[PDB]
């Protein structure tokens with residue numbers, strides 16, 4: 001393994017036993033973080049899906065994965081904005097949904113779904129690309145309690161530190177918002193929420209975000225975003241956990257909308 005460049009810590013290396021892979025290493029190799037990293041490796045090893053970054057092995061502790069040359073979807077969408085139409089955005093949306101559907105069949109909770117964690121293999125394929133916060137659900141519950149990127153958090157994650165497939169669905173709604181704002185920073189969830197809360201404010205931000213969400217304040221419909229797509233976002237952002245859609249139903253709806261858009265309805 002020959003170091004080439006740092007990517008994210010994550011590095012680009014050459015595994016040439018006399019070949020390009022991504023290598024995740026730990027910054028502060030403590031006992032607590034090593035135990036977490038060990039579980040992250042097992043989680044990624046257990047996942048085989050076209051839209052999940054491919055596990056390749058371990059090094060003595062280093063995590064070896066396939067190298068995805070277009071980097072994160074944020075950098076990619078920013079650089080290629082003008083040539084990424086809505087049908088393409090929904091192609092990525094569908095692939096993220098199906099990755100999350102598959103994650104759900106293992107009873108894994110991702111807990112960090114955001115465009116920053118999606119990587120781009122090529123113009124036609126994106127992959128969920130980091131699993132550093134992912135939890136395996138306990139046998140006795142449908143949620144995991146963990147004591148943060150608050151502007152992607154479901155209300156019950158903010159108030160009770162509870163994470164579930166349903167809170168992943170909320171965060172997917174925010175991902176869909178990020179895509180249809182073309183990840184413009186002035187439109188980003190943090191910028192929008194801070195303007196809605198009022199820039200007259202740390203812990204107080206979380207307080208006012210909770211109050212805002214409880215009063216059904218929401219991120220606005222992005223410019224140019226079709227109503228059917230904004231409707232999916234708002235269904236993901238239901239305060240009632242039981243009312244949020246499943247990833248399987250989201251995948252089917254996104255595919256139908258994409259096909260309708262391409263065919264002229």
Ligand SMILES: CCCn1cc(-c2nc(Nc3ccc(C(=O)NC)cc3)nc3[nH]ccc23)cn1
Pocket residue numbers: 007008010022053065066067068069070071072075116117118119129130
């Ligand atoms: C998502 C947060 C953690 N993280 C994961 C990675 C990662 N990156 C990449 N490729 C990559 C990255 C950046 C750039 C770039 O910026 N070029 C100007 C180009 C290619 N392949 C990966 N395979 C497995 C993980 C991983 C980086 N950070």
